Amino acid sequence: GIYTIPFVAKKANDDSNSSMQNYFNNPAWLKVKNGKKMVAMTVNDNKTVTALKTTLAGTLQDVKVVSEDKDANTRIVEFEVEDLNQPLAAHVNYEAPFNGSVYKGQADFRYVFDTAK
Amino acid sequence: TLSDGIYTIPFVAKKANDDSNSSMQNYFNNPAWLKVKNGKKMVAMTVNDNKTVTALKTTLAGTLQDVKVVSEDKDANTRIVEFEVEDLNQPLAAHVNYEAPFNGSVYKGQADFRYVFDTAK
Numbered sequence A: 001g002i003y004t005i006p007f008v009a010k011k012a013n014d015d016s017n018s019s020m021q022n023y024f025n026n027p028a029w030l031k032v033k034n035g036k037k038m039v040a041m042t043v044n045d046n047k048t049v050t051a052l053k054t055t056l057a058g059t060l061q062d063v064k065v066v067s068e069d070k071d072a073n074t075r076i077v078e079f080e081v082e083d084l085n086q087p088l089a090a091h092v093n094y095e096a097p098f099n100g101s102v103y104k105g106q107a108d109f110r111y112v113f114d115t116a117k
Numbered sequence B: 001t002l003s004d005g006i007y008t009i010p011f012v013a014k015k016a017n018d019d020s021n022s023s024m025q026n027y028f029n030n031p032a033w034l035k036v037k038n039g040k041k042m043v044a045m046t047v048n049d050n051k052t053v054t055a056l057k058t059t060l061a062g063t064l065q066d067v068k069v070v071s072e073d074k075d076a077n078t079r080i081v082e083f084e085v086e087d088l089n090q091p092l093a094a095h096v097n098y099e100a101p102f103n104g105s106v107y108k109g110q111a112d113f114r115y116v117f118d119t120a121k
């Protein structure tokens, strides 16, 4: 990475913060690779966040896992962003302990990058 | 409406924004007790996981007010809560604070839900 970009994970259907805001470290890394804009960020709870997909060419595509650190329960993910100036639609799969079982959920949210800073 | 007396009343804890069941339904024992005294309708129910459910509030006179704890059994991890209900024929808005074990940590959460009561017997 070279450029740093702050972001907020917002809800899918409103402008309030998503619960996903607690799961990513700020700011993200921003770089150009083969002419494309690549954003990288640390997922701070590797075990809970089981899958992450972001919008690319009209479909939700799995982010690239760059690095994984099971000892620290973190991983670094990277994804291509077509337009940094618009909210980016994302889809997450998660797992959490619940009343003696494992609750498996999924949700949509949006990344909003602070490009005007 | 109901005369002064004691009844059982089934209920369902529903989500705040839709009519599906809330995850809170697993935390309360059914049916609730309903006591009517001097025209005041009091609902009492057992919270079956005293440590997880840290606070509970229900709508009374247009605002969320803490429920009354009427019995607590720390050894069994349960408690009985009681609250006044103005109209049993409408969903009752509630708020919960909870603590959940979360992979060695304790997650502190909060959520809204609604109690929906069936006919008292």
Ligand code: HEM
Binding pocket: A010, A011, A012, A017, A018, A019, A020, A023, A048, A049, A092, A094, A095, A096, A097, A098, A103, A105, A107, A108, A109, B023
């Ligand atoms: C036992 C644990 C959990 C329960 C019972 C739970 C329950 C729910 C429910 C009912 C919804 C609302 C869906 C709708 O719009 O209809 C929701 C949304 C959501 N949940 Fe979970 N959830 C749990 C754990 C988690 C965890 C661990 C995460 C972390 C990734 C998470 C992230 C989300 C997200 C991101 C949303 C969408 C709203 C937002 O952007 O904040 N949930 N969850």
Ligand code: HEM
Binding pocket: A019, A096, A097, A098, A099, B014, B015, B016, B021, B022, B023, B024, B027, B052, B098, B099, B100, B101, B102, B107, B109, B111, B112, B113
């Ligand atoms: C690690 C554990 C947990 C996490 C991370 C978690 C996370 C969440 C999240 C993100 C939501 C969605 C909020 C929204 O509407 O945007 C939610 C909703 C909810 N959670 Fe949790 N939660 C956990 C455990 C539990 C537990 C143990 C309870 C039991 C009291 C619980 C009860 C609820 C309730 C009642 C809702 C609202 C949906 C419904 O009525 O079922 N959660 N939780």
Ligand SMILES: [Zn+2]
Binding pocket: A090, A091, A092, A106, A107, A108
């Ligand atoms: Zn989705």
Ligand SMILES: [Zn+2]
Binding pocket: B073, B074, B075, B076
């Ligand atoms: Zn005891």
Ligand SMILES: [Zn+2]
Binding pocket: B075
């Ligand atoms: Zn004892």
Ligand SMILES: [Zn+2]
Binding pocket: B094, B095, B096, B110, B111, B112
């Ligand atoms: Zn609330």
